[PDB]
């Protein structure tokens, strides 16, 4: 038996592009409805930074309150005035709904996943807070293409902690040496698969970059997730074409 674990964000769905889309829409809102000028982009830039700086959480968080607060702060830090929670909410929920709407599985990614599952067990392994990730999973309707879906923020530890990989292995009833991890992030997906002693790691190198020394090195590298079947058909995973 063989299994393939897939990363989610930016591997199977365009998360970053979806987020950019969300900012584009907020900018439009602030500029058209509220007549903001370039403070629109300034505020959005601030939120992006705040988003990027969130780390902890699992002990307990209301992500909606936290991220609404990023907006509230960014508005006040840019335009001053009294804190405006209502406007913060208007921005947040526009950004959120816009991004979730943008997240979809391309038809060739759907076909690819369908083909893989005929021969191997498929699992989605995605870092991030429970609510946000489950919302993304619902938005791109991907749960039906996998035998299981595991979310880092629902677990005790996330990628690259080997524990979450061993959990995934048990969930599918396989061993780490039966498994392949596919993802676009060296420090989570690849390091994690290396930590957990998986059969192989596949790095989707979208940026066409040479890993700086001291970075994790994957077993295999592809520029697109659509290259996976041919690759897996060559290593000990899928039968030859
Ligand atoms: Mg990713």
Swiss-Prot record:
Q: Which GO terms describe its molecular function?
A: N-acylneuraminate-9-phosphatase activity
Q: Where does phosphate bind?
A: 8-9, 126-127, 159
Q: How is its activity regulated?
A: Inhibited by calcium. Inhibited by vanadate, sodium orthovanadate and phosphonate.
Pfam families found in the cross-reference section: Hydrolase (PF00702)
Which InterPro entries does the entry link to? HAD-like_hydrolase, HAD-like_sf, HAD-SF_hydro_IA, HAD-SF_hydro_IA_CTE7, HAD_sf
Alphabetical GO biological process terms: CMP-N-acetylneuraminate biosynthetic process; glycosylation; N-acetylglucosamine biosynthetic process; N-acetylneuraminate biosynthetic process
Which SUPFAM superfamilies does the UniProt record give?
A: HAD-like (SSF56784)
Q: What is this protein called?
A: N-acylneuraminate-9-phosphatase
């Amino acid at each position: 038996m063989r299994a393939v674990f897939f990363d989610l964000d930016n591997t199977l769905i365009d998360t970053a592009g979806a987020s950019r889309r969300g900012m584009l829409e907020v900018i439009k809102l602030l500029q058209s409805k509220y007549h903001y000028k370039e403070e629109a982009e300034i505020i959005c830039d601030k939120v992006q930074v705040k988003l990027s700086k969130e780390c902890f959480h699992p002990y307990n968080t209301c992500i909606t309150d936290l991220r609404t607060s990023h907006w509230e702060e960014a508005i006040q830090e840019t335009k001053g005035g009294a804190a405006n929670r209502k406007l913060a909410e208007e921005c947040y929920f526009l950004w959120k709904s816009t991004r979730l709407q943008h997240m979809t599985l391309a038809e060739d990614v759907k076909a690819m996943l369908t083909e893989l599952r005929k021969e191997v067990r498929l699992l989605l392994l995605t870092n991030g807070d429970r609510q946000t990730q489950r919302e993304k999973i619902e938005a791109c309707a991907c749960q039906s293409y996998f035998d299981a879906v595991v979310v880092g923020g629902e677990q005790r530890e996330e990628k690259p902690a080997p524990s979450i990989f061993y959990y995934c292995c048990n969930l599918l009833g396989v061993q780490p040496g039966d498994c392949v991890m596919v993802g676009d992030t060296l420090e989570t997906d690849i390091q994690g698969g290396l930590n957990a002693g998986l059969k192989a790691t596949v790095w989707i190198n979208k940026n066409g970059i040479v890993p700086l020394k001291s970075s994790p090195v994957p077993h295999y590298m592809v520029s697109s997730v659509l290259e996976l079947p041919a690759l897996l058909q060559s290593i000990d995973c899928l039968v030859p074409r």
